[PDB]
Structures are given as C-alpha cells and as structure tokens.
C-alpha cells in the first residue's frame, strides 16, 4: 500500500507566532506540545531522498515523487530505518549536497499535522529565514478528494494569521 500526502505551506513572522502558537494549540486537540529538533539531509543519485535524525528515535527517511483541487500531492513512501543509514547511502553511491536542521513546534489533529519551524543552515547553526513555516501534511493511502476537502475548512480557520497556499 502506497499513500500520497496533502500538504501546503506558509510562513509566519516572529511577532505573529506568539499569537499563532496559542491559536493553533487551542483550535486543535493536544496537550503540552513538544519542541522537535531534527537534522535533515537530501540525497541525489533524480530520486531526491530526505533522511531525518531527531534529537533517540531512529533515522526516518522519506521520498516525495513528482506532484500529481486546492492541494499539492505527490506520491510518498516513508520508511523508518535504523542507525548508520548515512554511511549506508554512501556505499549506495548517493551524494549529499546540503543538510539543514529544523527547529520548532508541531501540533496534531484527527489526521492532519501542523508543524511550525524555521530552517537552519549548517556549515554552526544559522537562521536561513527570520519567519517560520507551517504546513498541513496529511498522510492517507489511496488519496481521494474527500480528505483534501477537510483541509480547506481548517485552512480557512487559520486564514487570518497566515494565508497559505501550495507552490
């Protein structure tokens, strides 16, 4: 079974966020969100792969195909892998061009997930952007229009603070 995601992105100023975090937390159901610190890579043989380490969970990698409605969808197959993956993909022949760590908070929902973070460039962490980014990644096998429609309602609820659209 293979699933394709429904995600679409937007960014939020620093002063804005203080209202956004309270807005998102109350709007959706959750308890005491968690700060997620992960160190992501990108691998090219063309078959662009993303392997993420989080500061004791295992290295989770994910592939996103080419995009295929009010949503952006590309075939995705995400597979959890144990440690020592990076050297494994070196022996594969894959080459790493850049790697960036992401910092922020994520809030959940019934199916959809919201994660607010800022991209850090590595040389040694530097803020690539002054404003965070938020997406509404939804994972669902055999994607149908019904799942995407539900996101439209939720996005409209979040429209005032940040207006987000797929790109």
């Amino acid at each position: 079974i293979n699933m394709m995601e429904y995600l679409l992105q937007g960014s939020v100023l620093d002063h804005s966020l203080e209202s956004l975090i309270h807005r998102l937390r109350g709007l959706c159901d959750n308890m005491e969100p968690e700060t997620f610190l992960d160190h992501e890579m990108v691998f090219l043989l063309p078959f662009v792969l993303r392997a993420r380490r989080s500061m004791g969970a295992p290295w989770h990698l994910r592939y996103l195909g080419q995009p295929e409605r009010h949503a952006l969808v590309r075939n995705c197959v995400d597979i959890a892998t144990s440690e020592n993956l990076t050297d494994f993909l070196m022996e594969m022949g894959f080459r790493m061009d850049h790697e960036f760590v992401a910092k922020g908070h994520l809030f959940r929902k019934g199916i959809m997930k919201i994660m607010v973070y800022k991209i850090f460039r590595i040389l040694s962490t530097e803020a690539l952007s002054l404003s965070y980014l938020v997406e509404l990644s939804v994972v669902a096998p055999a994607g149908q229009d019904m799942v995407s429609d539900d996101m439209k309602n939720f996005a409209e609820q979040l429209k005032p603070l940040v207006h987000l659209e797929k790109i």
Binding site: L13, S16, S19, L128, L133, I167
Partner: peptide, 21 residues
Amino acid sequence: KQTFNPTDTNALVAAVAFGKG
C-alpha cells in the same frame, strides 16, 4: 496588517523543496 510576509514564504519554501541555501 503585518504578521505574514509573503516574500519570506516564497523565498523560504523554495529552499525546503530544493536547496536555496
């Protein structure tokens, strides 16, 4: 009517999908 910079979104989004920086 601050609280969201569209250009920061577009410049940033171009980074995550393809390496901008």
